[PDB]
Amino acid sequence: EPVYLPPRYRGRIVLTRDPDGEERCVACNLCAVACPVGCISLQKAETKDGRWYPEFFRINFSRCIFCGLCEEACPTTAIQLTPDFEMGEYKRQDLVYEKEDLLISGPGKYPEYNFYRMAGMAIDGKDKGEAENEAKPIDVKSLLP
Template identity: 70%
Template sequence: MLSSVRSLWLVFLKMFRKRVTIKYPEEKPYLAPRWRGRIVLTRDPDHNERCVACNLCAAVCPTDCISLQATEDENDRRYPEFFRINFSRCIFCGLCEDACPTYAIQLIPDFEMGEYNRQSLVYEKEDLLIDGMGKYHGYSFYEQAGVAVGVKPKGGGENESEPVDVRTLIP
């Protein structure tokens, strides 16, 4: 009973504290550079798409708002044929960024994407792809992965040795 009275008093005192909310949009809040808002697709240092169409972002998405189709170029390098995010469903949870093994999907500090027409909230790959590397500089998945897709010869990746000679008999 007394603790309830104390609570009442403490809450009453909040009246004289500073407000924690601001008058958005007249005043803009400060957003940290790594604040997670709108989703973009980034490129690797060679200016190629980072996305390898692994589908992990789509699988982890709690609102199922990402869909894509994988395809390959002439070197068998995999990339998305289309990559679609239905932002009218997106909740900016950032799980796709967590799931992305190639740093392709990144969330940037922009969230002001209100539209009068819901259809305009459907973003295709052309709308999502940016020209830079985003938050992670210098990373290229295909330099690391064990597949050769025109980026490097077989065995030329980081931490890889030359392909073995199957015909040698040396123990």
């Protein structure tokens, strides 16, 4: 029979997407520095509109102890530990998961959060002042006192 795993179960790690379908990871490297094993490695790239994303992203699962500190440290909820434990491999080199092996097609355990809806940095589709709890930019040449 299939094994029952609770929703909090710390298993295989994925990178998730936002409700708009774009990857949540802003390549802020907080997961890599919070990893006590140091088995996360990534690099920041930027789109033409200024959106931060990971150029690559790799996890050494042969080193990973599945402690969940990266998911706890993620401020966009991109990286998540999912309830799945079937990860046995023939070669240890195949236990290094690149971004194509981690980026799922959905939001994972957090179905709605979008960090770029809260950030003040302007990306495509969110100009200045269009994020949450943000006023429109008042021009410094305005007539109003």
